[PDB]
Amino acid sequence: DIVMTQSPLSLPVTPGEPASISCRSSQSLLHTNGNNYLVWYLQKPGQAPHLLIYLGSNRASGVPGRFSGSGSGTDFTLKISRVEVEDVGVYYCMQSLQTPPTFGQGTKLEIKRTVAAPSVFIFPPSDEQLKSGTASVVCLLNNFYPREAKVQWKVDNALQSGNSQESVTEQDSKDSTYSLSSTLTLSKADYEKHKVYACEVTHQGLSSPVTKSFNR
Amino acid sequence: LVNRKQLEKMANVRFRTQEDEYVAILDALEEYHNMSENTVVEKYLKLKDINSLTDIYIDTYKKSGRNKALKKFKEYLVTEVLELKNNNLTPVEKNLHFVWIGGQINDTAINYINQWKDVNSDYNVNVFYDSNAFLINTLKKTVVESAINDTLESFRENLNDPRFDYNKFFRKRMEIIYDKQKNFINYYKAQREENPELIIDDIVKTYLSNEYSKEIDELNTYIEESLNKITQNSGNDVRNFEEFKNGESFNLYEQELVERWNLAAASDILRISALKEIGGMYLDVDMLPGIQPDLFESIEKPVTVDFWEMTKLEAIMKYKEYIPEYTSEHFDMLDEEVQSSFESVLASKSDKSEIFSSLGDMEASPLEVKIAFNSKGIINQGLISVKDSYCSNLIVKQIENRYKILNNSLNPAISEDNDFNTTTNTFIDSIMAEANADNGRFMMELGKYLRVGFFPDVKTTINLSGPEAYAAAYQDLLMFKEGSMNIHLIEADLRNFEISKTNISQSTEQEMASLWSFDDARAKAQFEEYKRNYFEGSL
């Protein structure tokens, strides 16, 4: 098989600036007919890949003009002349010379936007859940940038560990932010033995840690 | 030209999978139809890319069911080029370009040029000359004269035997001319190196004085009279033509001028560069203005189309006398009722502008160069082009490529410093090893290069710098390529580029004297002349 290798695999770019993605092939994609057999796709989260460039430098009809492909032989580049916030996703190159068609590892384009601190919300367990024995306490961190963030759970001022799980969204295609949920899981019996439930958030955008809490 | 949807239907093949190389054609064709606001040359270049993409497909999928329809699409691309050519015209710059290099211009050329001046007062006129090289004709004439006498003296058999094979004379003389020319070339190359301030006429003057005992005084007078005569007749110096001097054709120009003494080939090279850089109309000095169309339209024509045209000029010149010493031969042998009918029509006119037409405001495609035709096909004695036209570039490149092929085999053969026969065999053998079906006829004519102008029945110049280079450039245009060798275009294709006969009188007395080429009858008549001088001890 032909091995395709892309770089960088993570590409942070300020909107309005250019972005370049490199793709290298383990053997030449230049054909005696003069064409180079290399294609580029963009895969947006939860979608199938979408064809951008074929034959090395042909823009697929309907693809915005800011996308262009160049290169020859074993060395190829996808260039976005001026990146738009909707350009977030994973970019793949693929050789179109032989079967099996083989793909690069994928380059995730990330939009470098201004820092935004999370807005924090906390949700107590509902009676509809508690009647079957489990208590989920949910802490929401909404619309922040830097994706890096830390959530610590306190129960009657006692720091928790081992009983929470986080999930983070993909970067928003309009405002370039992330959101995060942290879910604390207790038995109903343990839940009703304590009063203060607090989610404590640290993030680059917060001059001090922010805490949201409730009493049962 | 078909749009994308129409090509999709035309090239639809049952059960054919779509190919990237096919979609590339479709995308490019759609881009073409969105180019309404681009220049004609940009549109041609897009058609060229569409043709190249179609060829890539056909070469990649040799057994594709699409290929029949795609070859028809390629025909449609050619038709669109002609549509572009015919529907987008721009003004032709009002310049008339003549060329007189390598010696003094003679009065008959001036008198012809003056006819164009007199009926085109809105046109600028250039007569390009080379201020460094007035002595080339003298050098060639002197060397050839001496080679003739050397050849006759060399014979160890009886010269005036009436059955003498005079081709023995031309073969031997060629061996001697080649040696003399080689000697001068080596002297010139050495002198140029040793003193880069010397111009050609400096080196020729010294060479002629030392080698042929010519008087430097008479050569200086000749140069001064030549310069004074040309600069009183719209002369413009090649040596100030910076675009020409700095391009890849200047060394080919000087190869012909200085090494081969072929002023016709040098003028071939210069004329199309002049046209490309300035625009206008190039004319050989034996061409005359078009005759006013309605002038002799009441006189019915009795011989041929060319003969009727020739006697039109002879009539004009007998009864108006614009050019003295113009012939009446083909006129002086007509019936009186029509001969005097010519005198009668001309008596009704008093101004030259009722005899000769004017060029006026002309326009042409930025793609094209228009060329004169005669009974034998295209001929570069007249050319029309807007400045920097696409074809003028294709023609310049055709000449440069043909010289590259020539010189790649010629220069190594000459470098061995062998005699003429040995050099020729090495050169021909090198040429033949690069011959194929596409270029064979051209390569065959290239093999005679060293004989040009010293030997009968040699057609090399026409294939190198002359009309074949134009036909090949037109083929380059219509077939979206460069480097055409063998010509597939038929006369109908080439006639897309004709200059209208209304704009030039080609059947002139001087033109006829210029197409009596180096025949076999000419070679025999020349030998008779040389023998006569030889048996009186003159040159």
CB contact under 8 A, B27 and A54: no
CB B412 within 8 A of CB B422: no
How was this structure obtained? X-ray
CB contact under 8 A, A61 and B27: yes
- Give CA torsion, residues B337, B343, B344, B347, to 10 deg: -170
Interchain contact A33–B (C-beta under 8 A): yes
Q: Mutate which of B17, B18, B20, B26 to disrupt the A interface (most A C-beta within 10 Å)?
A: B20
User: Terminal CA-to-CA distance of chain B, rounded, Å?
Assistant: 67
What's CA B229's distance to the chain center, in Å? 25
CB contact under 8 A, B24 and A55: yes
B393 and B248 in a common domain: yes
Task: Nearest by CB to B56, from A35, A54, A58: name it.
Answer: A35
Taking CA B436 as the corner, what is the angle to CA B433 and CA B437, rounded to the nearest 5 degrees?
160
Asked whether residue B130 is marked as a ligand-binding residue, the answer is no
CATH number of the domain encompassing residue A17:
2.60.40.10
User: Among B333, B357, B381, where does a domain finish?
Assistant: B357
For residue B408, count other CB atoms closer than 10 A to its CB.
12
Task: Nearest by CB to A54, from B20, B59, B60: name it.
Answer: B20
Number of domains in chain A: 2
- The resolution in angstroms reads 1.8
B283 and B431 in a common domain: yes
Interchain contact A65–B (C-beta under 8 A): no
Asked whether residue B275 is marked as a ligand-binding residue, the answer is no
A83 and A178 in a common domain: no
Lookup: tokens for A191: 């839940």
3-state secondary structure (DSSP) of residue A148: coil
CA dist B48 to B21, B153, B473, Å? 16, 61, 14
Q: What residue numbers bound the domain in which B45 lies?
A: 3-88
Q: How far apart are CA A167 and CA A153, in angstroms?
A: 15
Chain B residues near residue A61 by CB distance under 8 angstroms? 27, 30
A176 and A100 in a common domain: no
CB B117 within 8 A of CB B125: yes
Q: What residue numbers bound the domain in which A85 lies?
A: 4-111
Chain B residues near residue A54 by CB distance under 8 angstroms? 20, 23
A167 and A78 in a common domain: no
Chain A residues near residue B21 by CB distance under 8 angstroms? 33, 35, 55
CB contact under 8 A, B21 and A58: no
Burial B518-539 (b: 16+ CB within 10 A, else e): beeeebeebbeebbeebeeeee
Measured in degrees and rounded to the nearest 5, phi and psi for residue A16 equal 90, -15
Q: Mutate which of B21, B51, B54, B58 to disrupt the A interface (most A C-beta within 10 Å)?
A: B21
Residue A208 to chain B, least CA–CA distance (Å)? 57
List the single residue in B with minimal CA-CA distance to A60.
Answer: B27
User: Among B66, B88, B110, where does a domain finish?
Assistant: B88
Task: Label residue B334 exposed, middle or buried (CB < 10 Å: 0-12, 13-18, 19+).
Answer: middle
Beta strands in B346-481 (DSSP E): 363-364, 370-374, 377-385
Measured in degrees and rounded to the nearest 5, phi and psi for residue B126 equal -120, 140
Q: After which residues is chain B broken (C to N over 2.5 A)?
A: 302
A143 and A107 in a common domain: no
User: Among B34, B59, B88, where does a domain finish?
Assistant: B88
A123 and A105 in a common domain: no
Q: How far apart are CA B329 and CA B339, in angstroms?
A: 12
